[PDB]
């Protein structure tokens, strides 16, 4: 089983035993060398976070897509006859396009090559709708300039909603 | 007074620019040497001094 | 500076509209384009610094 991409990661992340790894790391902490010991510390911090929060790590690999309400990033016309749309909208659009075409290829029985191509384009589009440009060159409006502002792109930055809106308005 | 089909639209004057009208510039769709936006009717740009 | 790059952007649009259609005799009129150059110049004449 060589499974590549998110699928495999989902399976293994699911298989994880929080407790066992915990004890193992605890013993690994007593290692005399600062390397194994530091590693054990800095690593176990994560496992610990999971053990306490009771949140399962496999959740990191998501099957559903938390799609923000429509009126939170609408498309509304203005005076003059032309409409106006948010950036996250077109982002979500590319996301579902790849998502559907992928299914189309799946049931189709298409060969492995095409599969990996679209199946990967899924991870890149999806992750682009979350943080656009933290991995690889950002995606911009077709043929123009300004990189679509994704979810994580609205939060951070000096104009982040935490600042331009909620810590001052 | 019935609620009539058409409601007021017309462009008033800004709160703090009191002028006097000078330039009366009308541009109707269908006139020589004027090409308006795709599917718009007559416009007007009035000057206020 | 924008005339040149904005012309090259049409140079490729010329070399592409060649490899197909009717290679026998195509007047350069069907070969050349307007927008790839025009819009490329207007770009600098409006939205530049």
């Amino acid at each position: 089983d060589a499974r590549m991409g998110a699928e495999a990661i989902q399976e293994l992340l699911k298989e994880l035993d929080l407790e066992k790894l915990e004890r193992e790391l605890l013993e690994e902490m007593k290692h005399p060398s600062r390397a194994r010991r530091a590693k054990a510390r800095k690593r176990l911090e994560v496992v610990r976070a999971f053990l306490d929060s009771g949140n399962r790590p496999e959740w990191m690999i998501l099957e559903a897509v938390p799609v923000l309400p429509p009126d939170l990033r609408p498309m509304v016309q203005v005076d003059g006859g032309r409409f106006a749309t948010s950036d996250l909208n077109d982002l979500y659009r590319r996301l579902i396009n790849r998502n559907n075409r992928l299914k189309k290829l799946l049931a189709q029985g298409a060969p492995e090559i095409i599969i990996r191509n679209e199946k990967r384009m899924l991870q890149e589009a999806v992750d682009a709708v979350i943080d656009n440009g933290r991995r690889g060159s950002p995606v911009t409006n077709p043929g123009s300039e300004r990189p679509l502002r994704s979810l994580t792109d609205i939060l951070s930055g000096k104009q982040g909603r935490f600042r331009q809106n909620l810590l001052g308005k | 007074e019935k609620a009539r089909d058409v409601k007021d639209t017309s462009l008033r004057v800004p709160p703090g620019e009191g002028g006097i009208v000078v330039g009366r510039l009308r541009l109707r769709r269908g006139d020589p040497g004027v090409e308006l936006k795709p599917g718009v009717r007559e416009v007007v740009r009035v000057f206020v001094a | 500076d924008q005339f040149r790059v904005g012309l090259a952007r049409l140079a490729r649009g010329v070399r592409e509209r060649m490899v197909m259609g009717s290679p026998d005799t195509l007047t350069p009129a069907k070969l050349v384009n307007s927008r790839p150059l025009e819009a490329a110049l207007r770009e600098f004449f409006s939205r530049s610094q």
């Binding site: 998501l62 939170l72 979350i130 909620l166 308005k169 | - | -």
Partner: protein, 96 residues
């Protein structure tokens, strides 16, 4: 700007300035009643028009946006109350 016909900005520096003196409710109005808060800003005009005191705000509505915004990233926004218990941010809204 005077163009769109709107009020000035209370951005973080101003907020801190208020926190300094210690004016709490003054900051409340800023973050809610006199700014964004949905039923709040209306209840204000209601009160003042009726010659009374405006009720204390609840939902800033900008924050309400932030809630679902985070949720879009699969960030469970859990609002607690006075002792580790559920709270309905969006009044009777998304409760499915």
């Amino acid at each position: 700007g005077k163009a769109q016909f709107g009020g000035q900005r209370f951005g973080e520096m101003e907020v801190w300035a208020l926190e300094a003196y210690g004016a709490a409710h003054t900051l409340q109005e800023m973050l809610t009643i006199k700014s964004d808060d949905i039923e709040g800003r209306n209840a204000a005009y209601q009160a003042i028009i009726k010659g009374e005191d405006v009720p204390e705000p609840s939902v800033p509505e900008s924050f309400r946006v932030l809630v679902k915004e985070l949720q879009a990233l699969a960030l469970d926004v859990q609002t607690l109350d006075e002792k580790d218990n559920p709270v309905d941010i969006f009044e009777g809204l998304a409760s499915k």
